[PDB]
Subunit: 254 residues, 4 copies
């Protein structure tokens, strides 16, 4: 094996949903440093305009699209594939909403499940079709430790349910496409210091518990999550499929 | 503890969704034999009437309702509570649809998720409200080995994803309601001989593999799932919450 | 199915290691109340003096033996079989030792693995032989949440390693004996109030953290564990083999 | 982050047990290519001859030792520390023996556990001591899919139990040493083409099942396991501790 290039993505084109912020943006930085071209996908146009400057020439296309709109995902894949064959997909678009179960508005349950699960399936179906047609591809889904355990003390049962579905969706597609050369894996991060968690990290009644139940005693930085996505997306992970990789500072060990 | 009676349900009233058929109907038989009175809930009115007739005096109410209708679930729990305090809920209503991921109509993905996950949350919120107000209750969710592994050879990614979300919804409500006396657990059955599976069991190209992949070499009967549901719904399981109990003939061992 | 007898053990003889204290003793009480006669196995004679005096006529034999002595297990099964066919085995003999990993003496590691893993294999091979020949049997092993997660704040790496081995021992024998009618399952309890934990529960610096990290906010009672073992040993669990059943007040859900 | 260098091991010294063959030897190749110096540890002096002549100046020391000999592992860590600080430990020494449970002699069970579990503890205690003192290190343990599921059709209950202990030993040391900067993770490979499996791969009555039950339809190459071990040993895995990373071609997805 050539280990000095096994983690690189030279020649590849990767689509990333949720590319305008947070983990998804950091994954774009990791993938551009590793030689990939990028299809940036996000619902928020101004975030894509910022990303595309921090990324420059690695950027092959910039597609404003809602992952919950199935037809917009199938259009996004066809737009991307006219630019370059897309061999990597990262599903990072996702949302998290706090709600107590007995006081849950129906729309909040529905929205969290639509972005985190349904939109991951529309994007994986859209982009996975040409990968299956080529007989090669790699998908990396953003699961969570919340697909394995339940967070404390805050409540958000739609988020835990949505991430249990992401982990099984990952595994389902891994099994169905394994014979067709497309690997599908998920990260299960612990708390990460981004745009999704900053409001809760400013309430000591949550944050002190979150650190106390992490053996490493800190949140992860986005780059620690992006380095693991780069491993799963690269040829170094060529025998890894259907895996749920904990990247959580030990949270799920206790 | 009086082991003589710890598995009984005398004086309890249990609500069962999916009570008209299959596992749900057999759990109603088991619960009535254990002393419970019953709230039967099912979308199919003839199957409900036929269950209500068979169960006789054990039936406290018969409610024709769709679990995907959150308003209908809230109304069903108000109707039930007017008859008797409901201290057990079994969410057995569920559907399975075969589909190849790249040939998936959108409506199939959506409706499997609506029944299997959203309906379970609507019903659990609706009936759990009075359990939490009373400081006591037990919920048994029908998960599946498909929430832990992926079936073979047939494809149904929406079913796998739905059952991952069932297992984590179970756990999320177990965590949220632990301190107010409501236990929430899931069964994860292997193949069971019900109407859900009958067409597929009639296809040797499926069924031979099913039996070859089960260490016990046979498909479970509904009574073998209902006995495990009775365990989890009874006081014998008073320290069991958030558990996913495999009842699969060993399928998930291999 | 007759649900009113499906959890009973009438006519059975159950061998229970660790019968002199704690969970094993309470399992003896539960199985006697369920119609079984008992083979009490413990290396503490004085504890078998007390347990036999309480259990009275349910006792078919009392055997002072060390489960780490393979030859004494093979002889114990032959001594039991001479009195009655043993159709249930409960492996509850076990020890826990607190130790810093880097300063562990070789003897502590070896002691804990010998009792908790090797002894469970020697007893299972010894008692399982005649079960396999009869085509019928049930074995219940005492795993732990410590086979799934790692306890805090106290360290006991040999205990965690031994309970990971218990869980996979259980599943290995469930797979190998499934076609010959012997089911093998494990309980994975959370903290239980027995002599194994009494002086640890008297150290606030441990006990406060144990309760804080259990969603139900209390230790389990030995009867709560014994009811779950009675489920697994009974015909109600006829479709359950290779399962690891958490009985932990929700500890592994967080 | 500089993703260009985050997978490198420049300046590091890694000790590898089982370096003489298979996965351990391929990990030494991958580690040498990534800038590390190596401490080769194996019981086989003729295998060490071959490995050392290939790896050349990458070798800081070669030590003929049995990992089951606790004193030899303590002496190896001292010998290695006198050459360079050891900041990475790979526990790859391991054995597999086929045995039916009821025909198992006691010495087979003991020695599989002694190499696979006890020797991993002795080696991690010995080498881990200097890492914890420095407040930095990474350990990668060779677990297996056999710590999660049970192989078929061949029986080897001691191997399954040993690998369950490996996964929980990994997690216990990750929790105990997380505050001291030492990460501890395990790989859980599917079948890999090495000398451990050569005889079984040459038996169609095993091998056809192994391929049939792997979604990828092939065994893994040692390099595919070494690249994963390099990920976990490197700073790219800086937020990964106590993880069990499946590298199994999808085996554990079904
Ligand atoms: N931050 C964490 O602690 C953490 C922990 C574990 C898992 N995760 C998961 O990682 C993923 C990314 O999290 P993040 O912290 O980067 O979040 P973020 O809020 O910083 O970024 C999410 C991005 O997704 C986009 N997005 C949201 N909904 C969309 C939609 N319907 N269509 C298209 N784009 C959409 C947003 O515009 C945004 O740019 C999510 O799935 C999240 O659940 C985050
Ligand atoms: N049969 C199996 O092999 C198996 C295995 C594992 C898990 N399960 C799960 O167990 C549960 C019961 O399965 P089963 O085999 O008894 O199925 P079944 O088809 O025999 O019974 C399902 C019942 O649910 C009712 N139902 C369906 N959708 C509904 C809705 N929207 N609102 C109200 N009622 C509705 C149906 O009318 C029917 O009476 C399901 O969640 C299923 O996924 C079944
Ligand atoms: N108490 C708990 O919190 C807890 C939690 C989870 C799992 N467990 C497990 O449950 C099992 C029973 O625990 P417990 O709380 O009843 O412990 P206990 O200490 O109260 O009882 C253990 C019994 O096993 C006997 N025993 C110990 N080593 C033996 C050997 N070598 N040979 C024969 N007999 C031996 C002891 O003499 C004693 O009577 C153990 O495997 C333990 O690890 C306990
Ligand atoms: N090959 C596979 O399919 C596979 C699959 C999953 C996990 N594993 C695990 O990966 C590890 C390496 O396996 P492999 O395929 O490279 O095996 P291998 O047999 O090719 O190499 C094992 C090496 O360990 C050495 N060794 C054995 N016992 C020892 C002892 N007591 N002290 C010192 N050295 C000793 C051997 O001499 C040999 O050089 C083992 O833990 C194995 O269980 C292997
Ligand atoms: Mg936990
Ligand atoms: Mg499997």
């Amino acid at each position: 094996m050539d280990y000095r290039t096994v983690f690189r993505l030279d020649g590849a084109c990767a689509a990333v949903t949720g590319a305008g912020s947070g983990i998804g943006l950091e994954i774009c930085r990791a993938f551009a440093a590793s030689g990939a071209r990028l299809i940036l996908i996000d619902r928020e146009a101004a975030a894509l305009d910022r990303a595309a400057q921090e990324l420059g020439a690695a950027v092959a296309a910039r597609i404003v699209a809602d992952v919950t709109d199935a037809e917009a995902m199938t259009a996004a894949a066809a737009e991307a594939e006219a630019v370059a064959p897309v061999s990597i997909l990262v599903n990072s678009a996702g949302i998290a909403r706090l709600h107590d179960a007995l006081e849950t508005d129906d729309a909040t349950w529905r929205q969290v499940m639509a972005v985190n699960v349904d939109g991951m399936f529309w994007a994986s179906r859209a982009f996975g079709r040409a990968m299956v047609a080529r007989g090669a591809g790699a998908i990396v889904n953003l699961g969570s430790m919340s697909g394995t355990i339940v967070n404390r003390p805050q409540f958000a049962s739609s988020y835990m349910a949505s991430k249990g579905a992401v982990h099984q969706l990952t595994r389902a597609l891994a099994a169905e496409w394994a014979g067709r050369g497309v690997r599908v894996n998920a990260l299960a991060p612990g708390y990460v210091a981004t745009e999704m968690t900053l409001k809760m990290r400013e309430r000591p009644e949550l944050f002190e518990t979150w650190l106390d139940m992490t053996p490493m005693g800190r949140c992860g930085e986005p780059s620690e999550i992006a380095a693991a996505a780069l491993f799963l997306a690269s040829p170094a992970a060529s025998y890894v499929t259907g895996a749920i990789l904990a990247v959580d500072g030990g949270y799920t060990v206790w």
